[PDB]
């Protein structure tokens, strides 16, 4: 049975298999169970990445080295490959004879231990058509008598859903729980494993790189356990140096390389922002101000919040920034958010909250619970942010949604993690949560029934408190109140729309020229403080786009031309000088 | 895909768990990156480490063929792994890796393909390249934490417009030969830009390559004689128009005459209320002429007036003249707030979830149509 | 049905993803276009490029029936693809394609029939013609975006009254001979 079972001691002697550091309490309990009279079959149950196989495989490494109790010395540990047992078991009884013969060898020497990784598999292996004769029944009578010792290793999910079902087999196996190690316990493990990884990549790791890898992975890599998680950052870091030229950075990997690897794994911006990104970040405020005017206060809050995150002063577990942009209509609340993601080159997560008007609609964000038709679909918000952890989350018209939906965002702003129906935890630490609401629009624009008209600006704030619970408003970084667009900024907005018009006309091959006098006429004609700048988009469409459209289809503008717009002082009307060219 | 490939080589060169995983949305060329790795190896662009390496594609269907007897699948699976371990320089590529979770499953046995390969991935003896979508990776693959721990996820994202055009230029000689036609530089530029603006529910690499491929068959097969060797921008626009149901450059074609008589024809069928016809006919002209908003509908008009004056007639007679479907929605049914579910379907975990939304499904079926919400105030 | 057929031929001639899907309501000639494509090929109305091509009508129920094993389905299914892969001009017709996506050949697992043909369709090795209703297309189909990407969608609309009366005229000889009766033109209208 040499092909089905390998001798770990032989492998550990000629080479090395993950030298175990620590785990004295875990290995002592396992040795205690293995020294029992009956049911001396430990079961290393733990989460993936907690060193279950390391403890079993490392036991052999310890035995050869000699740091084991005298009772455990002289013993041989064998690893069972369940795939090799069922290799040629075509004929009836090939598995039973093959498996039973293997157990006889262990009983003869009476000093050998069997390691069966993924022990949950043997529960049903060996059934040909409808029989219960399997490795579980074939081993069962030999485990309760203490003739042989077998070490098992399986995950909690497999142990609870499969292994725990067989009460008879579970009783024979003594569940030895394995707990994730601490931050300090992990650095000593990497130090013991470092000589094996250094030789593979022919590099060297610094004392600070190891401490940073463990700490940085725990913060950002929240999907795997600490022992495997930290090793991934170390193993992948050395690979970069090997791929890089032998002369530039092949000797050693600095701490800067560790943060770069973790950033790519978590899809988050790396620390020590380069000068290239700094130029874009510094100019973010100026670029935004060229597309949105009259709301410089809001741009400052958004840009400043992002700077704190990159600079390293961001919140420990809260998002980059949580804001509730409230104000009049058409004042740039959604435009600033749509133009923020483009400036930073990140995905835009636009959510229309006018659809989440019912309590039952919350299942779309976090997914339906288990046992329902909607379990496969999953949460739309949790899935969207997992694929794009670095993005801008926009909840347009959040006030329209039911108050129940607001409660979901309490942990998104206080803790930064949302638990999906499947159990995974979304991460909002690098998400710029932005919310827009038009609450108080009726109240602020209303006219008081009195002699002295009143400043109803303070009425929207009161509505914000009635709709949003204090616990929700307290989590927000700050509430920015947008102001009505003045006559001076309206002129800039007109230029923006005219520029967009030129882009449309440029595709057709015709160039537009509008005199400054005409621009002022359009501004005063469609200037409505209460209605924002959306009416300005219609005074241009009716005055400029409508004549051009008729000429483009029926006129000289079919081919590339140079149209001009002018205002006659006598009539105060627009004149369109269409030219065929 | 230099950034995506660079990380793949780094993971493959790792001491343990050197099995990269390519997780991305469908249509982002995940298989192309894995399959394209072998192509680069032949040319020699890859580094010296990746040189002299062979990439094998696993056919799970064939592996599970004729394995009715016990132990047949285990022998085939453990025979291939031995070959990879012995070579020490081969790499396995498993397309749609979410299938190995249940592969080889028995009546009551839990000896799956993943369980057998599991001890070989953590050790680092073999290297495996996977490619699964986000939906399959979470619902079917992420559930097995043990297997996922042995793989390194690589997030692939749809390339930008500037990057997609370069991809088509590299693939263009393959499509040109098959379709015996030539694609102009502007044609490729238009397909990428037009696809993003009009084609939806598909990613940019697939979208752009669909317009380019379909355009070759049209020019090669639509004209029986007097064929067009080249493929100009006009042809690409028509193909995109068929996929998305609306044209962008045929407005100065015979349809041009229809827009001129649209206002006059409506006046004949509906007398009076000329101001309303002018609003609809001018909005369509601006949209078709290329002066649209590009982020809003063609037009949103709230026709308010007395009963029987033409509010529900101009709209009905606007679809017939334009030859487009009429999405008639009577708002008298949506009297309560709970009726909104009928428009956008019920949320997950509730009855009627599979039914979907009437308004959303209707618009998806007929994107080019007139949406009529009669008696909106009653809602 | 020349308009609908022309769209299908354009898709079949594509280098990749040449797998048209006929989407239409019940009783709208969903299978009359696939079956009739073979009739056109034999007669010769199809373009020259489509000549020498053979349409195969797959029966999922018959193939899936009698497996009683884990590998019997893949044994026969892969054998079918091997035949089609050998003949580059061969075309497959899968009536009611929505059945494979739900549960092709596996329950409580993930080795489905669709996954087997996913890589082949992406490479253009085989041509597959599918037929599924709008109701079975939005709920069952499109859930696995990967399979939906390979299959193009051809819109099928219910014909007008003038089109159906002409269609019945072509079918009159078959029905008349079967029943040994005559149908007056006025009766058909």
């Amino acid at each position: 049975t040499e092909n089905f079972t390998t001798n770990l001691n032989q492998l550990a002697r000629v080479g090395g298999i993950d030298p175990l550091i620590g785990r004295e309490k875990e290995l002592e309990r396992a040795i205690q169970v293995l020294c029992r009279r009956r049911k001396n079959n430990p079961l290393l149950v733990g989460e993936s990445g907690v060193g279950k196989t390391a403890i079993a495989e490392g036991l052999a490494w310890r035995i050869v080295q000699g740091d084991v109790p005298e009772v455990m010395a002289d013993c041989t540990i064998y690893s069972l490959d369940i795939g090799s047992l069922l290799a040629g078991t075509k004929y009836r009884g090939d598995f039973e004879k093959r498996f039973k013969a293997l157990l006889k060898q262990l009983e003869q020497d009476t000093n050998s231990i069997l390691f069966i990784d993924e022990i949950h598999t043997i529960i049903g292996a060996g059934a040909a058509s409808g029989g219960q004769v399997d490795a579980a029944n074939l081993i069962k009578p030999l485990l309760s008598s203490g003739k042989i010792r077998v070490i098992g290793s399986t995950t909690y999910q497999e142990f609870s859903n499969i292994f725990e079902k067989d009460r008879a087999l579970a009783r024979r196996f003594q569940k030895i729980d394995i707990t994730e190690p601490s931050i300090e316990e992990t650095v000593q493990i990497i130090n013991g494993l470092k000589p094996k990884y250094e030789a593979h990549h022919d590099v060297r790791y610094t004392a600070k790189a190891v401490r940073a890898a463990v700490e940085l992975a725990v913060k950002y890599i929240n999907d795997r356990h600490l022992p495997d998680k930290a090793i991934d950052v170390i193993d992948e870091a050395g690979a970069r140096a090997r791929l890089m030229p032998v002369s530039k950075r092949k000797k050693t990997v600095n701490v800067a390389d560790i943060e770069s690897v973790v950033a790519r794994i978590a899809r988050i911006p790396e620390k020590s922002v380069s000068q290239s990104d700094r130029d874009t970040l510094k100019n973010l405020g100026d670029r935004l101000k060229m597309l949105v005017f009259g709301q410089d206060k809001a741009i400052e809050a958004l840009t400043e919040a992002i700077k704190m995150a990159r600079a390293g002063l961001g919140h420990e577990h809260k998002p980059v920034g949580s804001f509730l942009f409230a104000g009049p209509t058409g004042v740039g609340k959604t435009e600033v958010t749509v133009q923020l993601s483009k400036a930073l080159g990140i995905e835009l997560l636009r959510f229309d909250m006018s659809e989440y008007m019912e309590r039952h609609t919350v299942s779309r964000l976090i997914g339906a619970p288990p046992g329902y038709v909607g379990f496969d679909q999953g949460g739309l918000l949790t899935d969207a942010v997992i694929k794009h952890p670095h993005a801008v989350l926009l909840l347009d018209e959040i006030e329209k949604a039911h108050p129940d939906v607001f409660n979901i965002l309490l942990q998104v702003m206080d803790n930064g993690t949302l638990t999906d129906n499947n159990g995974r935890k979304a991460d909002f630490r690098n998400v710029v949560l932005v919310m827009t609401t038009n609450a108080g629009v009726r109240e602020t624009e209303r006219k008081s029934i009195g002699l002295i008209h009143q400043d109803n600006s303070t009425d929207a704030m009161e509505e914000i408190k009635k709709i949003f619970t204090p616990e929700f408003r307290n989590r927000l970084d700050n509430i920015i109140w947008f102001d009505h667009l003045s006559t001076d900024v309206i002129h800039q907005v007109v230029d923006k729309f005219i520029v967009e018009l030129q882009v449309q006309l440029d595709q057709k091959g015709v160039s537009l020229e509008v005199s400054q006098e005409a621009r002022n006429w359009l501004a005063e004609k469609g200037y409505d403080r209460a209605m924002g700048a959306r009416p300005m988009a219609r005074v241009i469409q009716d005055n400029l786009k409508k004549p051009l459209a008729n000429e483009l289809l029926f006129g000289s503008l079919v081919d590339g031309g140079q149209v001009t717009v002018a205002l006659d002082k006598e009539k105060n009307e627009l004149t369109y000088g269409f030219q065929s060219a | 895909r230099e950034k995506e490939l660079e990380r793949a080589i780094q993971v493959l060169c790792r001491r343990r768990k050197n099995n990269p995983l390519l997780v991305g949305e469908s249509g982002v060329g995940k298989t192309a990156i894995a399959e394209g790795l072998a192509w680069r190896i032949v040319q020699g662009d890859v580094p010296e480490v990746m040189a002299d390496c062979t990439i094998y594609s696993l056919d799970i269907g064939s592996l599970l063929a004729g394995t009715k007897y016990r132990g047949d699948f285990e022998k085939r699976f453990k025979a291939l792994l031995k070959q990879l371990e012995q070579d020490t320089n081969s790499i396995l590529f498993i397309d749609e890796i979410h299938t190995i979770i249940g592969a080889g499953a028995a009546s009551g046995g839990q000896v799956d393909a993943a369980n057998l390969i599991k001890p070989l991935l953590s050790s680092g003896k073999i290297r495996v390249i996977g490619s699964t979508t986000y939906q399959e990776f979470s619902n079917i693959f992420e559930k097995d934490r043990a297997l996922a721990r042995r793989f390194q996820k690589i997030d692939i994202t749809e390339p930008s417009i500037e990057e997609t055009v370069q991809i088509i230029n590299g693939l263009k000689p393959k499509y040109e030969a098959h379709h015996d036609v030539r694609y102009t530089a502007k044609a490729v530029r238009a397909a990428v830009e037009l696809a993003v603006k009009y084609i939806n529910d598909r990613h940019l690499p697939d979208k752009a390559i669909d317009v380019i491929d379909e355009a070759g068959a049209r020019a090669r097969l639509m004209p029986v004689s007097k064929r067009k060797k080249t493929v100009n921008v006009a042809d690409i626009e028509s193909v995109v128009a068929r996929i998305a149901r609306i044209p962008e450059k045929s407005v100065s074609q015979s349809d041009r005459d229809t827009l001129k008589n649209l206002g006059d024809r409506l006046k004949m069928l509906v007398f009076g209320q000329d101001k309303a016809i002018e609003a609809l006919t001018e909005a369509i002209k601006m949209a078709r002429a290329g002066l649209g908003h590009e982020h809003k509908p063609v037009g949103s008009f709230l026709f308010a007036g007395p009963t029987g004056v033409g509010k529900t007639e101009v709209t009905v007679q606007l679809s017939k003249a334009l030859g487009i479907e009429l999405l008639r929605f009577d708002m008298s049914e949506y009297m309560e707030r709970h009726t909104v579910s009928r428009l956008i379907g019920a949320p997950p975990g509730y009855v009627g979830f599979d039914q979907g939304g009437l308004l959303t499904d209707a618009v998806i079926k007929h994107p080019h149509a007139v949406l009529l919400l009669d008696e909106i105030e009653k809602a | 049905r020349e308009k609908e057929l022309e769209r299908a031929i354009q898709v079949l001639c594509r280098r990749r993803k040449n797998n048209p899907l006929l989407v239409g309501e019940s009783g709208v000639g969903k299978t009359a276009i696939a079956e009739g494509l073979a009739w056109r090929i034999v007669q010769g109305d199809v373009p020259e490029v489509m000549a020498d091509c053979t349409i195969y009508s797959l029966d999922i129920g018959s193939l899936l029936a009698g497996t009683k094993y884990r590998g019997d389905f893949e044994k026969r299914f892969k054998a079918l693809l091997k035949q089609l892969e050998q003949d580059t001009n061969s075309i497959l017709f899968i009536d009611e394609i929505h059945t494979i996506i739900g549960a092709g050949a596996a329950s409580g697992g993930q080795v489905d029939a669709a996954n087997l043909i996913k890589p082949l369709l992406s490479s253009g090795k085989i041509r597959v013609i599918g037929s599924t209703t709008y109701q079975e297309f939005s709920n069952i189909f499109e859930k696995d975006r990967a399979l939906a990407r390979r299959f193009q969608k051809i819109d099928i609309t219910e014909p007008s009254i003038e089109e159906t009366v002409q269609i019945i005229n072509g079918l009159k000889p078959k029905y008349e001979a079967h029943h040994d009766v005559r149908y007056t033109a006025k009766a058909v209208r």
Binding site: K90, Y91, R92, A127, A128, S129, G130, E358, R359, H360, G371, Y372, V373, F375 | K68, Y69, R70, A105, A106, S107, G108, E336, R337, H338, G349, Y350, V351, G352, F353 | K68, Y69, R70, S107, G108
Partner: peptide, 25 residues
Amino acid sequence: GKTNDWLDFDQLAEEKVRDALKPPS
């Protein structure tokens, strides 16, 4: 507003059985 109604989803169970062979001689 009327109370909402939730609908459960039941999954069917079907498995494949292997087959052992016995040679006559």
